[PDB]
């Protein structure tokens, strides 16, 4: 079922650039592994190269007293797995104790 095919993946921002067009299978788009796709306008952008982990996000807001904050990374790419045999798209999480001030 068809996808938006793009000629560039921008690793800094994880953004799809250089629209070729739509109405193509991901298989046909990714015949060239330098390309990238979106399933739906606004959707996540997936590079056609072999999967690997994104860099961890910054630590989210802490919720004055000691709470806890999430950071996340995603397995981004096509036709493979990341470390733990993880399929492309998959988010992985870390949770941490955090302190802002001392109310």
């Amino acid at each position: 079922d068809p996808v938006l095919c793009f000629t560039q993946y921008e690793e800094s921002s994880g953004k799809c650039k250089g629209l070729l067009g739509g109405g193509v299978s991901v298989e046909d788009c990714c015949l060239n592994t330098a390309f990238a796709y979106q399933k739906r306008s606004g959707g996540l952008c997936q590079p056609c190269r072999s999967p690997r982990w994104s860099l961890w996000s910054t630590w989210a807001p802490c919720s004055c007293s000691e709470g806890s904050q999430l950071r996340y990374r995603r397995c981004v790419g096509w036709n493979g797995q990341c470390s733990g045999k993880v399929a492309p798209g998959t988010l992985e999480w870390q949770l941490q104790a955090c302190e802002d001030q001392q109310c």
Partner: protein
């Protein structure tokens, strides 16, 4: 008699520019269906658009190193075991060039890493307790009742061995690293011989929301 223009059909006007995968061609149409006549307006919009051409041929894929495998056992030629002894060994780890297809490029640099080692695998060593580790992550990070932990470990005292071994061939020397899981011998701390673990809950833990879907919460 004031007849407004109408677009005829799209037809291709350039060849597929690429020798593998998808590329861009150009289609073109004429304002001849019908032709504008007697002050009739010209057709609205574009006489040309991009169109995707499919070679159905895969492009070359350059190879990428996977990460280093584990260090092989620390051993020396014509010695059954060197563990628990002041005897430099040798060990290696390797990696594969994965992904290379259709005459794409090979990986750059070394498929093998070699170092020298002292084996303390299953060696009994006197053990001193670490002070407390820093608090670990909250686990499970999403699943229910996230808990945190820190440890005092029965840390081994490594033999005071040379950092380096003289070579036989060069005038040079080579680094020797301690390798292997030894058996550290501590007196009991909190009636434990290896590991003392504290745990406490994580406070005011947020749900794991997918960034892609998040801030589409009207509810």
């Amino acid at each position: 008699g004031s007849v407004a223009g109408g677009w005829g059909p799209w037809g291709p006007v350039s060849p597929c520019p690429v020798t593998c995968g998808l590329g861009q061609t150009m289609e073109q149409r004429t304002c001849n269906h019908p032709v504008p006549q007697h002050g009739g307006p010209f057709c609205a919009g574009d006489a040309t658009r991009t169109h995707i051409c499919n070679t159905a041929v895969p492009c070359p894929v350059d190879g990428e190193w996977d990460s280093w495998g584990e260090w092989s056992p620390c051993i020396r030629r014509n010695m059954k075991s060197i563990s628990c002894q002041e005897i430099p060994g040798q060990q290696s780890r390797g990696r594969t060039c994965r992904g290379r297809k259709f005459d794409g490029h090979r990986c750059a640099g070394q498929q093998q890493d070699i170092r020298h080692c002292y084996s303390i695998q299953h060696c009994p060593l006197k053990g001193s307790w670490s002070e407390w580790s820093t608090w670990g992550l909250c686990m499970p990070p999403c699943g229910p009742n996230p808990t945190r932990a820190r440890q005092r470990l029965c840390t081994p005292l490594l033999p005071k061995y040379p950092p380096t071994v003289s070579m036989v061939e060069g005038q040079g020397e080579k680094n020797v690293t301690f390798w292997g899981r030894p058996l550290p011998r501590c007196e009991e701390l909190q009636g434990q011989k290896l590991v003392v673990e504290e745990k406490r809950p994580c406070l005011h833990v947020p749900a794991c929301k997918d960034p892609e879907e998040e801030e589409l919460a009207a509810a």
